[PDB]
């Protein structure tokens, strides 16, 4: 399979630039946070 891939080269350079553009796309759209807000078996209710 790889023996065949190494005769192609140029086809797989395009696949790579697609993967990079795909990666670059997903990274920008994926929202960022710091640390997940975890359930800790407790919480409080303020009455004011």
């Amino acid at each position: 399979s790889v023996g065949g891939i190494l005769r192609s080269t140029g086809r797989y350079l395009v696949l790579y630039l697609i993967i990079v553009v795909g990666m670059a796309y997903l990274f920008v759209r994926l929202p960022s946070s710091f640390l997940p807000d975890e359930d800790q078996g407790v919480f409080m209710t303020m009455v004011q």
Binding site: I19, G22, M23, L26, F27
Partner: protein
């Protein structure tokens, strides 16, 4: 929030450059390092 913020590209830029240099020392080549460093997107795409 006011005292600095987002020094991540700054630090991951020099992280790439030090990885490049270390590989350059490993192979004794300014070019062969790229054959390793191009796999970075292959992992990131699946995570994303």
């Amino acid at each position: 929030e006011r005292l600095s913020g987002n020094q991540a590209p700054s630090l991951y830029a020099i992280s790439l450059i030090v990885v490049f240099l270390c590989l350059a020392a490993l192979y004794e080549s300014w070019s062969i390092p790229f054959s390793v460093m191009l796999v970075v997107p292959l992992g990131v795409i699946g995570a994303l």
